Amino acid sequence: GSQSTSNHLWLLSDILGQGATANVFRGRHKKTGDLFAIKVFNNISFLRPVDVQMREFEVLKKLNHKNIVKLFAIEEETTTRHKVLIMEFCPCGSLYTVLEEPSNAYGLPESEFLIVLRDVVGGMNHLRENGIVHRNIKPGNIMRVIGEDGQSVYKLTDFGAARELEDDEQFVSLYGTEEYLHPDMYERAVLRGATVDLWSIGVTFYHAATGSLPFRPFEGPRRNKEVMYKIITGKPSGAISGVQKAENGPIDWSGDMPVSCSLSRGLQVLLTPVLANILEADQEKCWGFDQFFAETSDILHRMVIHVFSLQQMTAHKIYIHSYNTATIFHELVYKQTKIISSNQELIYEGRRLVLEPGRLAQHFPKTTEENPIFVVSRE
Amino acid sequence: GSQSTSNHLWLLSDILGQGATANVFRGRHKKTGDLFAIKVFNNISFLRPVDVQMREFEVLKKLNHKNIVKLFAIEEETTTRHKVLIMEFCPCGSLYTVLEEPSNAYGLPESEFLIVLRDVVGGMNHLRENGIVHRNIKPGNIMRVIGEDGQSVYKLTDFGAARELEDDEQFVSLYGTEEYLHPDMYERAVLDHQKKYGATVDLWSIGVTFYHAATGSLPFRPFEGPRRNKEVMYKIITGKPSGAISGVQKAENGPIDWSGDMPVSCSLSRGLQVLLTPVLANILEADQEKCWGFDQFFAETSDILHRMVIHVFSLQQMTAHKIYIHSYNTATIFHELVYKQTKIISSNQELIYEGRRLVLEPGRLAQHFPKTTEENPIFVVSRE
Numbered sequence: 009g010s011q012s013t014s015n016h017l018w019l020l021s022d023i024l025g026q027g028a029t030a031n032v033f034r035g036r037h038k039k040t041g042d043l044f045a046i047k048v049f050n051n052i053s054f055l056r057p058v059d060v061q062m063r064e065f066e067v068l069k070k071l072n073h074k075n076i077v078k079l080f081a082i083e084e085e086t087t088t089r090h091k092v093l094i095m096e097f098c099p100c101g102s103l104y105t106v107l108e109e110p111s112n113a114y115g116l117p118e119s120e121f122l123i124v125l126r127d128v129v130g131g132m133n134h135l136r137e138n139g140i141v142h143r144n145i146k147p148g149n150i151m152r153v154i155g156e157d158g159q160s161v162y163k164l165t166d167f168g169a170a171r172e173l174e175d176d177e178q179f180v181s182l183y184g185t186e187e188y189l190h191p192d193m194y195e196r197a198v199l200r201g202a203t204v205d206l207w208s209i210g211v212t213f214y215h216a217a218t219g220s221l222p223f224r225p226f227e228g229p230r231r232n233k234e235v236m237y238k239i240i241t242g243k244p245s246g247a248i249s250g251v252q253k254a255e256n257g258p259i260d261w262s263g264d265m266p267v268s269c270s271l272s273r274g275l276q277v278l279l280t281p282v283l284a285n286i287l288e289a290d291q292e293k294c295w296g297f298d299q300f301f302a303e304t305s306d307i308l309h310r311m312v313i314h315v316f317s318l319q320q321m322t323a324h325k326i327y328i329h330s331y332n333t334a335t336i337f338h339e340l341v342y343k344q345t346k347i348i349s350s351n352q353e354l355i356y357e358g359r360r361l362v363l364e365p366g367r368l369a370q371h372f373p374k375t376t377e378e379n380p381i382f383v384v385s386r387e
Numbered sequence: 388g389s390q391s392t393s394n395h396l397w398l399l400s401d402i403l404g405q406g407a408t409a410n411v412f413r414g415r416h417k418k419t420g421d422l423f424a425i426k427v428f429n430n431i432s433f434l435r436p437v438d439v440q441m442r443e444f445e446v447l448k449k450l451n452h453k454n455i456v457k458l459f460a461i462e463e464e465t466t467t468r469h470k471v472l473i474m475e476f477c478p479c480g481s482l483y484t485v486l487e488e489p490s491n492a493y494g495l496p497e498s499e500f501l502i503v504l505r506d507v508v509g510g511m512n513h514l515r516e517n518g519i520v521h522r523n524i525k526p527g528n529i530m531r532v533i534g535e536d537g538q539s540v541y542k543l544t545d546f547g548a549a550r551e552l553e554d555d556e557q558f559v560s561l562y563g564t565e566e567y568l569h570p571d572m573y574e575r576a577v578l579d580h581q582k583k584y585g586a587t588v589d590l591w592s593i594g595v596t597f598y599h600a601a602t603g604s605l606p607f608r609p610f611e612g613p614r615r616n617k618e619v620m621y622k623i624i625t626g627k628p629s630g631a632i633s634g635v636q637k638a639e640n641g642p643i644d645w646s647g648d649m650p651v652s653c654s655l656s657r658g659l660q661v662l663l664t665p666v667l668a669n670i671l672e673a674d675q676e677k678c679w680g681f682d683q684f685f686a687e688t689s690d691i692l693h694r695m696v697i698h699v700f701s702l703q704q705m706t707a708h709k710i711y712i713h714s715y716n717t718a719t720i721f722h723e724l725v726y727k728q729t730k731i732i733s734s735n736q737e738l739i740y741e742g743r744r745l746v747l748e749p750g751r752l753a754q755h756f757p758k759t760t761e762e763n764p765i766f767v768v769s770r771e
């Protein structure tokens with residue numbers, strides 16, 4: 009069948025998404041023919057507590073960002089009178105289907121990954137500025153939109169398990185007397201969450217970088233659930249992935265990106281610390297947000313100088329800040345090349361290149377994979 | 388100063404209750420003049436997420452029981468149009484004020500206590516049947532109402548911190564796929580963690596409440612009292628050896644005196660204490676894997692409520708004894724309970740009732756024993 013509102017119309021066979029509590033359909037405005045995604049809650053859904061039901065509406069009401077799938081309106085279904093959500097339609101689908109593309113079997117292209125990095129981060133920041141916590145971030149609900157400039161824009165959606173956090177202050181005054189409180193209640197209301205998203209993002213970022221999941225059972229994630237729980241909960245600090253090659257074999261843990269990572273070493277080495285800190289179940293040790301945004305911004309504010317090592321026959325991306333000196337450039341070159349700065353001899357556009365030790369990165373000549381700054385070691 | 392709605396009117400001076408997010412006032416209905424309690428929220432309270440604000444209302448919409456303060460209507464205040472709660476008014480007040488009665492300084496009388504036990508369990512069962520957790524139960528919240536027989540009825544109220552908890556079991560794959568879920572989320576995604584947790588916090592509060600009612604004292608007492616010294620309070624509640632039902636700080640910065648038993652000054656029969664302490668001990672456990680479930684709690688407490696009393700008097704020590712026994716319990720178990728309180732070996736146990744040696748058949752049921760009273764009790768002497 010079909011359903012509608014006074015402004016929109018959709019067919020139930022036009023499913024875009026299915027979940028425990030709701031479906032999302034592709035609909036059209038009755039007068040313009042403009043496309044929208046309509047989220048409609050199911051009967052099961054109405055058995056949850058009313059205040060829980062109210063959460064998503066309240067969360068989406070708070071958000072308006074380029075990296076959050078846009079809420080256009082809340083309308084009433086003509087027959088049921090049930091409130092539905094009218095949202096931005098993203099005909100390209102999600103980071104899920106992108107990752108299904110073969111060309112992306114060992115990770116997104118470096119530029120597209122950086123896009124993912126920028127947009128997911130921008131979305132998180134927005135959730136954080138609004139006291140929101142999503143709790144179920146996955147490639148499947150990070151939607152892709154081809155922007156004005158032909159470039160992808162990513163946008164978060166599916167805030168079904170989301171909720172607003174509050175500072176404790178409103179709760180505490182709430183209990184007058186403490187003599188009857190449970191220890192936990194006491195701890196919470198007398199003496200004195202969000203990091204769950206950071207974990208999901210960490211895993212999402214891992215998947216985008218490698219085409220693989222960081223933690224997986226030998227049998228695969230869906231089938232071995234016991235194993236999975238031990239892996240993520242028994243994870244050595246600093247580790248980024250743990251895999252089981254054995255039927256009931258031990259977990260091979262790693263602190264670095266796998267060898268087939270689609271990203272340059274330049275970026276791998278920046279990305280790793282970020283993952284290691286967010287993929288920390290112990291809330292004590294996981295990064296807080298202000299640090300997460302700061303470290304990722306530090307990745308995104310860098311420019312790239314393309315280097316090619318002629319002695320090693322390898323290509324390199326140097327992630328440097330526009331204000332960084334040449335001294336620093338050479339140091340970043342050594343970090344990947346293992347050619348001491350003293351022995352680094354450069355060549356640009358067929359002629360030898362010499363850099364004042366105090367020149368600035370934004371005044372280096374323009375480089376490209378096709379036209380890089382060559383390095384060689386001169387003993 | 389005063390406020391109003393279409394139907395009710397209250398004077399700001401007539402405050403019945405006062406808290407962080409709301410006040411409760413005594414009002415009258417504009418036509419009938421019937422008294423009611425009215426809960427009015429403060430502005431600060433509206434800074435909370437709307438869904439949180441909703442809860443108390445959505446809770447009170449679900450509840451209907453004799454042990455839960457009744458909701459009459461949700462109306463709007465005339466000047467602000469904010470929603471207010473029209474509630475059953477309880478002139479008598481709460482279990483808290485009852486316990487402020489001099490005669491209750493060492494606990495309630497067995498008769499009230501048993502009533503308090505029954506009602507609280509009844510209400511807590513209603514909450515549990517509706518997935519609710521109160522979270523802030525205390526004598527101050529437990530309202531007292533005179534029933535038709537002149538007997539007390541107790542009723543829960545003040546659901547300011549309450550919420551209705553989702554049963555995770557009811558749905559399949561609430562979260563679509565798990566590969567990206569934080570471990571806590573994964574747990575909820577595949578494992579009654581939240582419902583089992585929320586449940587216990589009310590059990591604890593109920594424990595402290597019953598201990599208070601039975602003794603006139605709080606079980607966990609820093610030397611300066613709970614309000615004065617929160618670090619110790621916490622250490623005591625957090626550091627309590629299992630089986631312990633109280634911890635008291637006798638002196639300043641002194642060690643703690645732990646007890647697994649009721650204090651000797653307790654106003655309850657030993658018959659009742661022996662039954663109550665294991666209940667107190669298993670709900671006053673901070674340890675999730677050690678504490679009782681709700682089901683045990685209900686089974687164990689109803690075990691107490693569905694026992695009959697047989698009044699015995701021991702000629703040995705000249706003392707009276709309440710013997711808590713099930714209508715289906717046998718003579719065998721009766722002499723057992725008697726010895727536990729009397730120390731008279733079962734065999735030496737010679738009984739006298741209404742001036743005649745009582746010969747209990749070996750297997751007859753405690754339902755077919757003589758009806759006793761504190762005034763007409765079975766006497767028991769040793770035949771040595």
Ligand SMILES: O=C(NCCCNc1nc(Nc2cccc(NC(=O)N3CCCC3)c2)ncc1I)c1cccs1
Nearest residue numbers: 024025026027030032045097098099100101105149166
């Ligand atoms: O939201 C959810 N899940 C997120 C998805 C559904 N929800 C929305 N979906 C779109 N757009 C969309 C959807 C599906 C497929 C596609 N297209 C493709 O996949 N293509 C086309 C080109 C290659 C493959 C686009 N917009 C806005 C929304 I809100 C939920 C699932 C269960 C409860 S909620």
Ligand SMILES: O=C(NCCCNc1nc(Nc2cccc(NC(=O)N3CCCC3)c2)ncc1I)c1cccs1
Nearest residue numbers: 403404405406409411424474475476477478479480545
């Ligand atoms: O709910 C709360 N606190 C619980 C109570 C307030 N709320 C209600 N209160 C009554 N009745 C009532 C109350 C207080 C006192 C009395 N009477 C006395 O104290 N007496 C009478 C004789 C001697 C002293 C009666 N009914 C229904 C309700 I809802 C809150 C405190 C802060 C926010 S909420």
